[PDB]
Amino acid sequence: MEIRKKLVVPSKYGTKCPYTMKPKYITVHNTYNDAPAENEVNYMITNNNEVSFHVAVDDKQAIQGIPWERNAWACGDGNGPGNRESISVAICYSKSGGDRYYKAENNAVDVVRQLMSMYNIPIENVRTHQSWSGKYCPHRMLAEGRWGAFIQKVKSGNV
Amino acid sequence: MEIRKKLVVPSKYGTKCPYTMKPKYITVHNTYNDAPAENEVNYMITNNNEVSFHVAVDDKQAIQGIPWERNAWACGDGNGPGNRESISVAICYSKSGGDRYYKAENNAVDVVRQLMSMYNIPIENVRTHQSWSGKYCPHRMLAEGRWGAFIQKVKSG
Amino acid sequence: MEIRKKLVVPSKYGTKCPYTMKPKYITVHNTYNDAPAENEVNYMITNNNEVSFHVAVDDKQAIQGIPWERNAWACGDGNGPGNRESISVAICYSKSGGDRYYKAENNAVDVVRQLMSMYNIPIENVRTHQSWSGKYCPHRMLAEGRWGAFIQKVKSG
Ligand SMILES: [Zn+2]
Ligand SMILES: [Zn+2]
Ligand SMILES: [Zn+2]
């Protein structure tokens, strides 16, 4: 699917994405919220907190807020490989789940595949936020045990 | 056992428990300190740190510092299910362990069971702090491998 | 091998080692850099950052910057057992890796064993940074699953 652009202004780089990056991993997240990707992104590029992610994906679209080759602060691991080498994808509507979320998860499969192809990132380098810092994210994918299936679709699904 | 109330004042909600909450999980901690519940709570409800927990439990009593239906900042998972959907129970005297701590842990079984019954929280929703953010808490229960037995006690009594 | 004592001046202890410590655990890290043990330590002692580790090791030498019997902030567990009860050992060249790092790791096994027999720290008390805070460290070791073999080398020699 087409990944919509809505990057943060270069003037906030020092706050949202100060460092350049050579993508080597893709980190999947759940927002633990029920807001659309546009809202999630818009908020992330407007507030002045050192919190960010590359792309938000909901049941309808994918919107990019941080240049792919600049780091984001979403893996909570300081300057570890999480925040300094991975591209973060945030799946919307996970708080309450429902068709909206499962639809957004399917779109996220698309996004991860494009990113893997785009930066030549292998399937084994597709990770959960939890693998980097220990935080329970993506909470819904973890609690429902959907990670394994998500991975196989990205890996060999014809979607 | 009775859970005494020594709640934070309303004016400090924005810092200690800014959000209403619908209990879905119970998170167990170890304070890594050798102070009684009254001290742990008195300190937590008075200082101005955005750090808090619902109830402290020692070898003698159980004291609640935050309303059960308001979040607490004890899971370090920011705005995740840990800090927004679980009630935090802290077991005292874990720092040195001993009888005082074991008695406190057993009392915690009862407190946890009371919370489960009160908000119909299944046994599978009784979690450790570590499961939410990775911190080594409850340190003593994890170190001495007492979590399994804990769950069983809570399951029966 | 021999560990130098490029220890930070006692005047900076208040930030690198402001707490007396009784060594009970050993935490192994991965610098996530391509700099030698000399520069790592020499750096960690210059800046007045609230970050520090006890000893760094590379394919060449092993250097100590923080007194063994004093705490060091490197496990990111606030004031928990990780930071207040363990000796942090940082292995260099984890970023790029290669012969340097691998040789640096074999050396680290020597440093660990020395610390153990010196402070009677049992093999089960040799942990990763990850076990304390959930952080992915030592990254390369974990990525390559070299930990299980590491603990075995510490046992033997
Ligand atoms: Zn996340
Ligand atoms: Zn805890
Ligand atoms: Zn580390």
DSSP string, C88-116: EEEES-TTT-SHHHHHHHHHHHHHHHHHH
How are beta strands A55-57 and A62-64 bridged, if at all? antiparallel
Q: Domain span at residue B95? A: 1-157
Contact C135 A135 (CB under 8 A): no
> Side by side, which strands form the sheet with B126-128?
B3-5, B62-64, B55-57, B86-91, B25-30, B126-128
Say how far apart CA B129 and CA B31 lie, in whole Å.
Answer: 11
Nearest CA in chain B to A140: B81
Say how far apart CA B20 and CA A35 lie, in whole Å.
Answer: 19
Instruction: State the smallest CA–CA distance between residue C157 and chain A in angstroms.
Output: 31
Ligand 3 is an ion; residues with CB less than 5 A from it: C 29, 129, 137
The annotation status of B129 as a binding-site residue, yes or no, is: yes
Beta bridge partners, B27, equal B88, B127
Ligand with minimal distance to B30 CA:
2
- Taking CB atoms within 8 Å and a gap of at least 24, the contacts of C10-17 are C12/C45, C12/C48, C13/C70, C15/C48, C15/C49, C15/C50, C15/C52, C16/C44, C16/C45, C16/C52, C16/C65, C16/C66, C16/C72, C16/C73, C17/C52, C17/C66, C17/C67, C17/C70, C17/C71, C17/C72
Domain count, chain C: 1
Contact A134 C137 (CB under 8 A): no
Q: Give resolution, Å, one decimal.
A: 2.2
Q: What angle separates helix A147-156 from helix A99-119, to the nearest 10 degrees?
A: 50
Residue A81 has its nearest CB partner, among C130, C133, C139, at C139
**Burial category of B80 from C-beta neighbours within 10 Å (exposed 0-12, middle 13-18, buried 19 and up):** buried
Question: What is the C85 CA–ligand 2 centroid distance (Å)?
Answer: 17
Helix or strand run (H / E) with residue C40: helix C37-46
Nearest CA in chain C to B32: C80
Q: Which residues of B touch C136 (CB under 8 A)?
A: none
Q: Residue B82 is part of a domain; what is its CATH number? A: 3.40.80.10
**Burial category of B49 from C-beta neighbours within 10 Å (exposed 0-12, middle 13-18, buried 19 and up):** exposed
Neighbours of chain C (3+ CB pairs under 8 A): A, B
Q: Which residues of B touch C133 (CB under 8 A)?
A: 134-136
With CA atoms as reference, report the closest residue to A105 among A75, A159, A69, A141.
Answer: A141
Tokens representing B56? Answer: 């402290």
What residues contact residue B27 under an 8 Å CB cut-off, 6+ apart? B74, B75, B82, B86, B87, B88, B89, B127, B128, B129, B132
Report chain C's C-alpha Rg in angstroms.
14
Nearest CA in chain C to B135: C133
Contact A133 C137 (CB under 8 A): no
Question: What is the C24 CA–ligand 1 centroid distance (Å)?
Answer: 33
Ligand with minimal distance to A141 CA:
1
Residue type for position C78: G
The technique by which this structure was obtained is X-ray
Ligand 2 is an ion; residues with CB less than 5 A from it: B 29, 129, 137
